[PDB]
Amino acid sequence: RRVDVMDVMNRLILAMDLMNRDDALRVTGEVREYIDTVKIGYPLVLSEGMDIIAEFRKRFGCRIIADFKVADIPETNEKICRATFKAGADAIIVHGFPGADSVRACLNVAEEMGREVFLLTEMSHPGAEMFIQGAADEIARMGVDLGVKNYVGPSTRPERLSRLREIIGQDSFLISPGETLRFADAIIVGRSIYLADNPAAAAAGIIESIK
Amino acid sequence: RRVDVMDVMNRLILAMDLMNRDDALRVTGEVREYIDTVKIGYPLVLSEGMDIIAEFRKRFGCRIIADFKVADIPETNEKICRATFKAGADAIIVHGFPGADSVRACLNVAEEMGREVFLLTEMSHPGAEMFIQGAADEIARMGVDLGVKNYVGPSTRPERLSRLREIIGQDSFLISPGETLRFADAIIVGRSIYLADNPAAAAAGIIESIK
Numbered sequence: 382r383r384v385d386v387m388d389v390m391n392r393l394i395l396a397m398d399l400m401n402r403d404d405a406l407r408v409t410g411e412v413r414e415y416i417d418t419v420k421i422g423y424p425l426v427l428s429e430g431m432d433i434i435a436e437f438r439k440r441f442g443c444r445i446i447a448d449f450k451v452a453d454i455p456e457t458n459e460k461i462c463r464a465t466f467k468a469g470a471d472a473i474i475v476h477g478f479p480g481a482d483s484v485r486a487c488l489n490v491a492e493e494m495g496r497e498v499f500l501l502t503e504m505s506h507p508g509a510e511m512f513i514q515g516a517a518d519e520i521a522r523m524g525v526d527l528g529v530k531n532y533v534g535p536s537t538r539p540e541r542l543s544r545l546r547e548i549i550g551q552d553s554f555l556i557s558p559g560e561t562l563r564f565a566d567a568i569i570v571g572r573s574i575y576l577a578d579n580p581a582a583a584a585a586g587i588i589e590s591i592k
Numbered sequence: 593r594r595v596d597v598m599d600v601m602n603r604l605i606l607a608m609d610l611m612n613r614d615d616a617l618r619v620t621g622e623v624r625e626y627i628d629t630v631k632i633g634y635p636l637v638l639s640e641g642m643d644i645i646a647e648f649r650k651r652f653g654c655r656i657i658a659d660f661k662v663a664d665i666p667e668t669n670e671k672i673c674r675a676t677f678k679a680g681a682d683a684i685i686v687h688g689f690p691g692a693d694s695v696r697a698c699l700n701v702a703e704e705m706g707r708e709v710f711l712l713t714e715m716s717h718p719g720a721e722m723f724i725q726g727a728a729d730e731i732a733r734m735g736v737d738l739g740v741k742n743y744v745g746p747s748t749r750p751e752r753l754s755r756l757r758e759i760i761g762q763d764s765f766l767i768s769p770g771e772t773l774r775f776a777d778a779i780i781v782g783r784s785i786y787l788a789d790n791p792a793a794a795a796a797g798i799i800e801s802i803k
Contacts, residue, residue: 400671422664424671427679431638452663452687453633454717460611460635468638476663478689480719506665508691511734516723523722 386554389567390417396571402429408575415584422448431468452476455486462490472497477520499531500524521548597765600778601628607782613640626795633659642679663687666697673701683708688731710742711735732759
C-alpha cells in the first residue's frame with residue numbers, strides 16, 4: 382500500500398445500506414474487529430439523521446465514507462460537503478458527470494477541512510451503459526487533472542479496473558463495489574455481510590479469502 | 593395550465609437553500625401568501641434533518657419538492673425516494689445521466705406512493721458543458737420514453753427551453769431555475785427572495801413582473 386493514501390483494514394469496506402439504526406449499529410459493531418472503514422449512504426442518513434455518522438465514529442471508531450454521489454452545481458456541492466464533513470465523515474463520494482468545477486468545489490472543502498473526496502468514475506448497473514460508460518475514461522482523466530487521489534470504480538468487469546489504473550496511475554487509492562485486489566486497494570461488500578446470520582463470521586470469511 | 597400536472601401558485605417556486613432552520617422557516621412563512629411551492633435541498637435537510645420537510649408542510653401547508661438530484665443505482669434510488677416521500681415530500685428531482693433503470697426505480701416508488709418525479713435534463717453551471725450538455729436531449733427523450741411528466745431544465749438560455757419543449761411536448765410540466773414562462777410552467781427563485789430584507793415584498797415584486 383501507499384503511505385499517502387488511507388489505510389483500510391483488511392482491504393474490506395462495509396457498505397452499510399440498512400436503513401434502520403438498530404440493525405445498522407448491530408452489524409457494524411459486530412465486524413469492527415475485522416473492518417475499520419464503513420460506507421454509509423442516504424438510505425440510512427435520511428432515515429435516521431446525519432447524527433448517525435458521529436455515532437458510528439464514537440461507538441466504533443471506524444472511518445466513515447459518505448456515499449452521497451454528490452452531483453449538484455458548485456455552490457450546492459460545497460454546502461453538501463461542508464455539512465457532511467461537519468457531521469464527521471472522513472470522506473465523501475462525488476459524481477464526475479457534472480463537470481470539473483462541481484468536483485473542484487468538493488475538493489476545496491475537503492482541503493479546508495482535512496478530509497477526502499472520492500471521484501466516482503463509473504457505475505455497473507444496466508442503465509450505466511447509456512451515458513456513464515462512455516464518459517468514464519474522460520471523468521477519470523478529469524480527476525487526474527484535478528489532483529484527485531481517491532476513486533471509486535466498477536468491479537463486475539476486471540478489464541475496466543485495468544483501464545482505470547492506466548489512467549489514474551498505480552499510486553492513487555481505488556475502491557471497488559480476488560483479481561479485483563490486483564487493481565483496487567480495497568473492495569466494498571454489503572449484502573454478504575449485513576444480511577448474514579452472523580456478520581462477524583461473514584466478514585472473517587471473505588477476509589480469509591483475501592488471505 | 594394543464595389540469596393533470598401540479599398547480600404552482602403564481603408560477604413561482606422558492607428555492608430555500610438556507611441551511612439554518614430558523615432562517616429557513618422565517619423566510620418561507622413570510623412568503624406563503626405568494627408562494628405555495630418550496631424546493632428544499634440537501635444543504636438544509638442534512639443540516640437540520642428530514643423532519644424539516646414535515647414542519648414546512650405542517651406550518652405552512654406548502655408543496656415540497658426535494659431537490660436531491662438522485663443519482664445512484666436502481667435499488668438505492670428506490671430507498672432514497674421512499675425515505676424522502678415517507679418524510680412528506682410531494683416530489684423529488686432525479687438525475688437522468690445514470691440511465692433509464694435508475695429513473696424508473698424512482699418513478700415506481702412515486703407511483704406506489706402517489707407522489708411525483710421531476711427529471712433533471714440539464715444544468716447551467718460552467719462544468720455542465722463537459723458531459724451534461726451533450727446528453728441533455730437524449731435524457732429528455734429518455735424521460736418521454738419513461739412516461740415522465742415533470743422536468744427541470746436550464747434557464748439562462750431561452751433557446752434551450754424551446755429545444756426541451758420540442759422534445760417533451762407542450763403538456764408536460766416544466767420548471768426552470770418573462771420569456772422563460774413562455775416555455776416553463778414555473779420559475780425557481782432563491783437568492784432574490786431569501787436574502788432580501790423583506791422577502792415578502794421581494795416575492796410580491798417578482799410576481800408583479802409576472803403579471
